[PDB]
């Protein structure tokens with residue numbers, strides 16, 4: 001769910017409030033997403049969005065009541081490393097992987113303040 | 124919470140249904156507990172019970188709405204190893220530790236079918 005993803009980014013980037021720092025960034029970070037990513041961080045978000053889309057196609061996900069945003073899964077952060085729990089069922093394990101890859105990506109790319117709340121008339 | 128503890132024991136003992144195998148065992152495994160533990164597994168349960176008691180004394184726990192049984196915390200199981208998440212707050216981190224130590228203990232001691240549903244008139 002959204003809360004585990006928030007916690008994953010803080011595990012990788014301890015100094016951030018992700019929901020504040022990464023939501024509404026570029027053409028992909030935030031609900032939805034269209035166009036050409038404006039930068040590398042925006043590219044991370046595009047991959048993550050494709051990952052959730054991939055996930056929804058999954059038979060194990062279509063059976064669940066909740067979508068990738070409210071689908072709680074299990075993970076741990078210890079020493080700034082993320083571990084998706086083996087207790088997660090197929091769908092949850094897939095989302096956890098999507099979220100874990102994005103958190104790592106976020107922590108590896110430059111952040112451009114100018115792309116925050118990006119004028120979606122540039123997407 | 125009770126559900127994470129259940130999941131922790133299965134992480135260590137993949138062949139079990141803990142709620143079925145370990146509840147109602149000896150004088151300590153299960154809600155409550157009094158007397159002299161009947162065996163090593165029962166001793167594991169006594170330590171775990173003392174651990175929750177310790178936890179409740181904790182200032183950070185007394186502030187919470189829920190007791191150790193319904194207090195959700197975060198952890199992962201990967202390769203049969205348990206990791207308490209660093210996202211857990213003081214109280215949750217303490218319970219997770221209590222639960223993790225008990226799961227490991229359970230997996231290290233012999234199980235005696237004869238102590239199941241132990242005649243609490245022997246406690």
Ligand SMILES: CCCCCCCCCCOC[C@@H](COCC(F)(F)F)OP(=O)(O)OC
Nearest residue numbers: 006018019022023028029030031045048049
């Ligand atoms: C007017 C309403 C528009 C505002 C958007 C609603 C706010 C809810 C947030 C939804 O969250 C969208 C999102 C969150 O970004 C991650 C972070 F936790 F760090 F913010 O998914 P995405 O895959 O797009 O990010 C890569």
Ligand SMILES: CCCCCCCCCCOC[C@@H](COCC(F)(F)F)OP(=O)(O)OC
Nearest residue numbers: 129141142145146151152153154168171172
């Ligand atoms: C008539 C009602 C009595 C039945 C008991 C209620 C059932 C709810 C279970 C409560 O659970 C008690 C308990 C669970 O044992 C762990 C396991 F998940 F493996 F079962 O805590 P404890 O510290 O004592 O174990 C060491």
Ligand SMILES: [Ca+2]
Nearest residue numbers: 028030032033
């Ligand atoms: Ca998006």
Ligand SMILES: [Ca+2]
Nearest residue numbers: 151153155156
């Ligand atoms: Ca007990």
